Design a protein around this ligand. Sequence first.
Ligand SMILES: Nc1ncnc2c1ncn2[C@@H]1O[C@H](COP(=O)(O)OP(=O)(O)O)[C@@H](O)[C@H]1O
Lengths: 83, 78
Amino acid sequence: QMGCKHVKGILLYGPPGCGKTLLARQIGKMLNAREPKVVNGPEILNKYVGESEANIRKLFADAEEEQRRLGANSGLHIIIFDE
Amino acid sequence: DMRNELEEMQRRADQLADESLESTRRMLQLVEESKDAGIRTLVMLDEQGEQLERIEEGMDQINKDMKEAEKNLTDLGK
Ligand SMILES: Nc1ncnc2c1ncn2[C@@H]1O[C@H](COP(=O)(O)OP(=O)(O)O)[C@@H](O)[C@H]1O
């Protein structure tokens, strides 16, 4: 009735080893979301043309297809970016 | 400027055979033998048909002869 969209992402910063991935996984598990995809920044880069972009692009395919199929009654997908 | 590009090479999977030369030869030999057997059966069947046709005429002749003889004997008897 209100017509309000949902928040699309958040950012967590702090010293290493203080429990950020734990919090992210717990948030994902609490909302009855599917298994999250965990990624690492330095491991995406590549030395061929159009390879890093493909890796970045490949993470949204499941959500895209599920929305195209089930419309507005789909589940919740979570993506976690580290570094 | 570590932007590399590549080119491609192709290989052809072996064509459909290397199993069509062991069962094949046996198949051909068996087909030849069956053809020979069929030819022999043809010849024998034609001979048998000729012999049956030959038998027919003697059969008819004996039937006619016996009927005529019986009728003649009956006619003379009475
Ligand atoms: N607040 C916390 N309570 C309990 N264990 C914690 C906490 N913070 C960190 N840990 C422990 O430290 C480990 C590593 O933390 P991690 O999630 O890798 O932190 P970060 O994302 O900041 O590197 C966790 O698996 C857990 O064993």
